[PDB]
C-alpha cells in the first residue's frame, strides 16, 4: 500500500559516482589548467560546494576573476568536493587555505583552522 | 599526510544543493518533457543513479519509453533527495520507470508493495 522509504547511503553513493566521472573526465563541462596541471570537474558540483563558483556559473555576475594560488591546493579542494575527505599536512595547509579562502569554502577553512589549533 | 579531515554531512549537502539546482532549473543540461510537464536534471546525476542513463551519456549521443510523468517525478525525487514515497496510486507507475532505467534499488522497493 502506502509507505515512505529513505536510503541513507544514497548521497555518498552518488558522490562516489560523481568522483569516478571526474577522475575519468566523463561528463565534465569544466577543466582547470594551472601551469600544465589539469583538473576536470562538473560545474554543478563546483557550485554546490563553493559559493564563488555558484556566483560564477549561476549568477554570472559580481564575481572576481579566478585566482588559484597553488595547483596542489586546488587538487585538495576538488578532492574534498568529490570525497568529503581532505588530507592536511603542516606543509600544505596554508596552500589549501589560500584556495579555500578565495572560493569562500568555510568548511575547508574550518578544517584548516582545526589542524593549526589541534595539531 | 599527518591528519585527514572527514565531513560526514558533505555528501548530503551536495545532493541537497544539486536538488535545489534541478528544482530551480539551474545549471541543468537535461529537460524531461512527458505529457506536458517539464523536468530539469543533470546528466551527471542521471548517469550516477541509473545504469541506463549511464550508457546513454558516456557512450552515446531522444525518445524514452516512459509511461507517465508521475512515475518519472517520484524517480527523479529519489535521485536528488534519497527518499522514495510510494502509494497504491503510483507504485505501478514508479516500477515501470524504475525497470526501464534499470534501478533495481527502486525496483525491489516497489516489488514488495
Amino acid at each position: 500500500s502506502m509507505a515512505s522509504m529513505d536510503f541513507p547511503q544514497h548521497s555518498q553513493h552518488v558522490l562516489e559516482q560523481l568522483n569516478q566521472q571526474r577522475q575519468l573526465g566523463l561528463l565534465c563541462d569544466c577543466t582547470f589548467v594551472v601551469d600544465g596541471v589539469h583538473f576536470k570537474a562538473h560545474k554543478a558540483v563546483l557550485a554546490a560546494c563553493s559559493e564563488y563558483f555558484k556566483m560564477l556559473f549561476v549568477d554570472q555576475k559580481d564575481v572576481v576573476h579566478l585566482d588559484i594560488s597553488n595547483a596542489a591546493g586546488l587538487g585538495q579542494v576538488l578532492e574534498f568536493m568529490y570525497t568529503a575527505k581532505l588530507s592536511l599536512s603542516p606543509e600544505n595547509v596554508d596552500d589549501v587555505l589560500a584556495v579555500a579562502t578565495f572560493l569562500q569554502m568555510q568548511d575547508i577553512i574550518t578544517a584548516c583552522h582545526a589542524l593549526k589549533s589541534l595539531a | 599526510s599527518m591528519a585527514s579531515m572527514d565531513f560526514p554531512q558533505h555528501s548530503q549537502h551536495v545532493l541537497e544543493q544539486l536538488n535545489q539546482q534541478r528544482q530551480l532549473g539551474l545549471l541543468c543540461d537535461c529537460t524531461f518533457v512527458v505529457d506536458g510537464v517539464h523536468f530539469k536534471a543533470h546528466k551527471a546525476v542521471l548517469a550516477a543513479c541509473s545504469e541506463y542513463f549511464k550508457m546513454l551519456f558516456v557512450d552515446q549521443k531522444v525518445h524514452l519509453d516512459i509511461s507517465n510523468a508521475a512515475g518519472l517525478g517520484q524517480v527523479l525525487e529519489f535521485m536528488y533527495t534519497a527518499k522514495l514515497s510510494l502509494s497504491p496510486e503510483n507504485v505501478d507507475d514508479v516500477l515501470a520507470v524504475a525497470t526501464f532505467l534499470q534501478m533495481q534499488d527502486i525496483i525491489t522497493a516497489c516489488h514488495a508493495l
Binding site: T31, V33, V34 | C30, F32, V33, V62, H63, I66
Partner: peptide, 21 residues
C-alpha cells in the same frame, strides 16, 4: 510517449598561472 531534450555540451576551460608569490 516522452521527449528528452539534451543541451549541447561545450567545455569550459580555465587556464590560470599560479599566484604563488
Amino acid at each position: 510517449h516522452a521527449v528528452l531534450v539534451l543541451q549541447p555540451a561545450v567545455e569550459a576551460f580555465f587556464l590560470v598561472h599560479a599566484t604563488e608569490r
